[PDB]
Design a protein around this ligand. Sequence first.
Ligand SMILES: O=C(N/N=C/c1cc(O)c(O)c(O)c1)c1cc(O)c(O)c(O)c1
Ligand SMILES: [Mn+2]
Ligand SMILES: [Mn+2]
Length: 177
Amino acid sequence: MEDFVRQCFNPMIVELAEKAMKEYGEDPKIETNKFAAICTHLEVCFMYSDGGSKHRFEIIEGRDRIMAWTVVNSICNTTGVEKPKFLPDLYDYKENRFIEIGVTRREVHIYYLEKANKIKSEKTHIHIFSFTGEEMATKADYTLDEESRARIKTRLFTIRQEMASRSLWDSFRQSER
Ligand SMILES: O=C(N/N=C/c1cc(O)c(O)c(O)c1)c1cc(O)c(O)c(O)c1
Ligand SMILES: [Mn+2]
Ligand SMILES: [Mn+2]
């Protein structure tokens, strides 16, 4: 699985994921499923940010915490939007709202609900993807066009297929709590 992550995700994603894990005192070489999940989430966030017009999205995920909150507080002051309690993943300049992105190995509806409980904010939009082509977004509002969304769902299915081929998928699918 460590070989898999290092060959399927670009080095910038891998580096961010290793750092996030070490910040919690986890070793990427041991908790390899968490490692893979962090990388996949990061890639989806970056893919989503590329899905719109140039300048449609500001990326918040993948930033150190000081810069992430600088970006968030800046947007709240520039736009007057409510300040979230937790860092979201992106801000949408077209829709004027923060987005929380979820990627789940279980079922989208359960993950949407968990996310909606934790976020517990009216303001933040939630968009969940599975590795088997399912998605679920706030007010059935999917933000991006179908072509962009299909390219994300396809990348996730491809990662699922690659893990499967290495007999990694079963352990990975079962590691999400
Ligand atoms: O919950 C998330 N990450 N991990 C939290 C976490 C908390 C712990 O106490 C651990 O021991 C751990 O391994 C991970 C998580 C999930 C997302 O979709 C995000 O966008 C995000 O910023 C964080
Ligand atoms: Mn995030
Ligand atoms: Mn997220």
